[PDB]
Design an enzyme around this catalytic site. Structure first.
Site, mmCIF file in Angstrom:
data_model
loop_
_atom_site.group_PDB
_atom_site.id
_atom_site.type_symbol
_atom_site.label_atom_id
_atom_site.label_comp_id
_atom_site.label_asym_id
_atom_site.label_seq_id
_atom_site.Cartn_x
_atom_site.Cartn_y
_atom_site.Cartn_z
ATOM 1 N N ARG A 88 -1.983 -5.758 -10.238
ATOM 2 C CA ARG A 88 -2.775 -4.529 -10.272
ATOM 3 C C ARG A 88 -1.906 -3.351 -10.694
ATOM 4 O O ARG A 88 -2.358 -2.469 -11.418
ATOM 5 C CB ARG A 88 -3.400 -4.256 -8.902
ATOM 6 C CG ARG A 88 -4.340 -5.357 -8.427
ATOM 7 C CD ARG A 88 -4.883 -5.055 -7.058
ATOM 8 N NE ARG A 88 -5.489 -6.232 -6.443
ATOM 9 C CZ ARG A 88 -5.869 -6.302 -5.171
ATOM 10 N NH1 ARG A 88 -5.707 -5.259 -4.367
ATOM 11 N NH2 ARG A 88 -6.414 -7.418 -4.710
ATOM 12 N N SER A 89 -0.658 -3.345 -10.240
ATOM 13 C CA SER A 89 0.270 -2.286 -10.600
ATOM 14 C C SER A 89 0.458 -2.296 -12.119
ATOM 15 O O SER A 89 0.520 -1.240 -12.754
ATOM 16 C CB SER A 89 1.609 -2.509 -9.898
ATOM 17 O OG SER A 89 1.474 -2.393 -8.493
HETATM 18 O O1 LIG Z 1 -0.027 -7.958 -5.849
HETATM 19 C C1 LIG Z 1 -0.204 -8.313 -7.013
HETATM 20 O O2 LIG Z 1 0.761 -8.131 -7.971
HETATM 21 C C2 LIG Z 1 -1.487 -9.015 -7.542
HETATM 22 O O3 LIG Z 1 -1.768 -8.647 -8.737
HETATM 23 N N1 LIG Z 1 -1.610 -10.476 -7.531
HETATM 24 C C3 LIG Z 1 -2.840 -11.143 -8.038
HETATM 25 C C4 LIG Z 1 -2.652 -12.381 -8.841
HETATM 26 C C5 LIG Z 1 -3.737 -13.150 -9.405
HETATM 27 C C6 LIG Z 1 -5.099 -12.733 -9.203
HETATM 28 C C7 LIG Z 1 -5.366 -11.556 -8.443
HETATM 29 C C8 LIG Z 1 -4.273 -10.723 -7.837
HETATM 30 C C9 LIG Z 1 -4.764 -9.522 -7.070
HETATM 31 O O4 LIG Z 1 -4.324 -9.215 -5.996
HETATM 32 O O5 LIG Z 1 -5.745 -8.766 -7.679
HETATM 33 C C10 LIG Z 1 -0.518 -11.269 -7.001
HETATM 34 C C11 LIG Z 1 0.659 -11.536 -7.816
HETATM 35 C C12 LIG Z 1 1.785 -12.325 -7.337
HETATM 36 C C13 LIG Z 1 1.770 -12.885 -6.007
HETATM 37 C C14 LIG Z 1 0.604 -12.643 -5.154
HETATM 38 C C15 LIG Z 1 0.569 -13.206 -3.819
HETATM 39 C C16 LIG Z 1 -0.588 -12.980 -2.940
HETATM 40 C C17 LIG Z 1 -1.697 -12.192 -3.404
HETATM 41 O O6 LIG Z 1 -2.809 -11.962 -2.582
HETATM 42 C C18 LIG Z 1 -1.666 -11.635 -4.731
HETATM 43 C C19 LIG Z 1 -0.535 -11.838 -5.638
#
Ligand SMILES: O=C(O)C(=O)N(c1ccccc1C(=O)O)c1cccc2ccc(O)cc12
EC number: 3.1.3.48
Length: 282
Positions: free
Chosen positions: A220-221
């Site tokens: 998301r960042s």
């Molecule tokens: O926190 C993040 O960077 C997030 O973008 N992650 C996501 C990855 C795939 C699909 C959706 C998301 C989301 O939260 O919208 C994540 C990236 C890397 C590790 C993660 C571990 C747990 C989690 O809930 C999100 C992660």
């Protein structure tokens, strides 16, 4: 025209295919400091670490590690610090960084709890009369004001360096409506959130880089940063149709791994920029 390109990918439903190409082409650098045994408890995820060359160093002789990366967009003249959502034991490190980097704003793109589990430590005070004190980095944090809105909340916080007695006003920009699964229905609210952050001056050069995070600080960042820069780039160049988002993402990926974790997220970034360009264009 990226909107035209957009419809081609959608048409032939090749989002996953394109996201994968980006993944393959993405940079790969050492993350040695992040992997040192001493820093085990400073990382939320085993597979999400800051490249050594672009990591943020805490100004302490002890352990200068924090899972955060400095993404410097030279052409756009915009910098961002992407980090993971702080942990029970790294909240003082998190605020030490904000202080040390002279950040004006903090962008949170997730909720403390999602899908029934902790995705980030409660790192800021929820009540004005209950200030927080991080003993390890000698910092005091106070909730000065909060403004809750339909899709997000802005908090006015006061960060004090107890060592010097110096204080600074920190703006906490918390996007509270990001879905538990998938991405937002329309980029509308996301974009407005972005512009509010811009309007605050937190993204401006007279301040240190903004601090952005979700849980891993890459998915998301990454969307937030990719969208902002692309829009800025279309606002600077003579030909806004020259801004290649895939290109920009790869450039950012030289500074931190995995920005944009899914094809959905990538598709969403296109929407955000395309929809943002229609408004930002004038
Ligand atoms: O926190 C993040 O960077 C997030 O973008 N992650 C996501 C990855 C795939 C699909 C959706 C998301 C989301 O939260 O919208 C994540 C990236 C890397 C590790 C993660 C571990 C747990 C989690 O809930 C999100 C992660």
């Amino acid at each position: 025209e990226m909107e035209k390109e957009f419809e081609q990918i959608d048409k032939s439903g090749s989002w996953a295919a394109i996201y994968q190409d980006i993944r393959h082409e993405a940079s790969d650098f050492p993350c040695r400091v992040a992997k040192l045994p001493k820093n085990k408890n400073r990382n939320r995820y085993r597979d999400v670490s800051p490249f050594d060359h672009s990591r943020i160093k805490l100004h302490q002789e002890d352990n200068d590690y924090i899972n955060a990366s400095l993404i410097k967009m030279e052409e756009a003249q915009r910098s961002y610090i992407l980090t993971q959502g702080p942990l029970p034991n790294t909240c003082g490190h998190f605020w030490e960084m904000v202080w040390e980097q002279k950040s004006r704003g903090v962008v949170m793109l997730n909720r403390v709890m999602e899908k029934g589990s902790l995705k980030c430590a409660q790192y800021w005070p929820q009540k004005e009369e209950k200030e927080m004190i991080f003993e390890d980095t000698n910092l005091k944090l106070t909730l000065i004001s909060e403004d809750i809105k339909s899709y997000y909340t802005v908090r006015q916080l006061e960060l004090e360096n107890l060592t010097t007695q110096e204080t600074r006003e920190i703006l906490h920009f918390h996007y509270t409506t990001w879905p538990d699964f998938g991405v937002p229905e329309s980029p509308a609210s996301f974009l407005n959130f972005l512009f509010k952050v811009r309007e605050s001056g937190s993204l401006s050069p007279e301040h240190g880089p903004v601090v952005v995070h979700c849980s891993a600080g890459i998915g998301r960042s990454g969307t937030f940063c990719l969208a902002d820069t692309c829009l800025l780039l279309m606002d600077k160049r003579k030909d806004p149709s020259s801004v290649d988002i895939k290109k920009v993402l790869l450039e950012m990926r030289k500074f931190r791994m995995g920005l944009i974790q899914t094809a959905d997220q990538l598709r969403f970034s296109y929407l955000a920029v395309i929809e943002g360009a229609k408004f930002i264009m004038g």
